[model samples]
Target: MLVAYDSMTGNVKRFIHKLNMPAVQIDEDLVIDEDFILITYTTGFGNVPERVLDFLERNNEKLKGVSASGNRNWGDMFGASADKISTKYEVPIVSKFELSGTNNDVEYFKERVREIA
Candidate 1:
């Protein structure tokens, strides 16, 4: 399995790193074909970043699951990218991350992938 991500604040990258999983930039070229789990960071007003939106729009066919990093203080907007992507692509939301994520968050995301992806 592969993970694809976009991290402006580096939080998404940090979270994926803790998962100790295979991941690449959402826009990274892929020579081999395989579905990928997505982890992206929400931008202003807790909306999906433009880059991530374009990625999903173009690669929804290959998306397996979705996750996102957002500020808890963003209230209902926190981690909302996951929800939008989930609805748009009809994919399961693996989880939401608050910034870099905790150890348990990493573990939970890893475990959920087996079932969702």
Candidate 2:
């Protein structure tokens, strides 16, 4: 299994590094052909990143679940990207963490990954 992520402002990138799991950054030239979970930062009113959507368009078949990072100050929009993708792609929302996440969040997120992966 793999963790595929997209980071803006480096928060998501920082979070993934702590997971210490096999991972890949979601990018235009990347393609994941194995079961993986996605972690992305919410953008503009809880929207999924355009790069992620394009990546999913081509590689969604292998995506097993998703997690997202957002600003808690965004209120109802927090981690909304994960919610949207979970629904649209018919996968579970594995976790939601704010910005880079806390130590507690990292551990919990890792547990969730273990359950699914």
Candidate 3:
């Protein structure tokens, strides 16, 4: 399972759909067990989305050992947020993709996940 906070005009949703992966849009009740959480959110002038901020604050403990995917900007936020989450939970970041030429170099992201997972 995948948990995505897509703010990219549906590009991330389309990509997930192409992979035939089951995903849940960001919401208050969203939860997953024994599955990865792939967060796909765009930066608003180099900041995470408001909803993501809320999630990170509330469910950070629940995200321990979960996998996530996001652009470089989001990855930075995750790193900062992970520090807080990791204190209480064992949130270990597995994979990340910066907003570079990853769309063209598909294997870049794949290899990262492979290495981490």
Candidate 4:
């Protein structure tokens, strides 16, 4: 499956690094070639990053699921962007991943991709 990601610092980027797959960075890319498992970060009271929002607005139909990263300190806001996007786009929220997450985190997220794929 294709992938799309947005990272705040390097936390989300580190997670994608281990993914070892070619995933598009929404911040840098102008086009996505396939339906994707969208992985992103939640910021400031669950706000979706502007780039992520714009891509989703244009490509939501190609979304299979979403995975998100956030600081747990945000409490309920943690990973909230994934929840909202899932709701708005009618796709699954596959995971609320932490910094760099675990191997299992990536696997679970992939399972969701396989499901919708």
Each prediction's Cα RMSD?
Answer: 1.6, 0.8, 4.9, 1.6
1-117 per-residue lDDT for model 2 (tens digits): 699998868999999999999999888888787899999999989999998889999899999999999988999999999999999999999999888999999998889988997
TM-score of 1: 0.92
Per-residue lDDT value at 100 in model 1: 92
Segments of candidate 3 deviating more than 4 angstroms = 1-3, 62-105
Q: What digit string (tens of lDDT, one per residue) describes model 4 on residues 1-117?
A: 878888878888888888777787785346665778899998799989988998888778778889898878899999999999989989888789877798998787767677877
Candidate 2, clashing residue pairs? Answer: none
> Candidate 1's residue-wise lDDT over 1-117, tens digit each?
799889886888888888778888866344326888988888868789988887766678888898888889999999888888888889999988788989988998999998875
lDDT, residue 111, candidate 1: 92
TM-score of each: 0.92, 0.96, 0.53, 0.88
lDDT of each: 0.84, 0.91, 0.46, 0.84
lDDT per residue as tens, model 3, 1-117:
344545446655555454444556666665545444444444443344566666555555445333333445353564343333334456554434343224533454444445544
**Clash tally for model 3:** 1
Pairs that collide in candidate 3 are 72-98
Best by TM-score: 2
**Count: clashes, candidate 4:** 0
Candidate topping lDDT: 2
* Candidate 4, lDDT over the whole model: 0.84
Worst 10 residues of 4 by lDDT: 25-34
Quality of model 2 by C-alpha lDDT: 0.91
How badly does each model clash, as a count of residue pairs? Answer: 0, 0, 1, 0
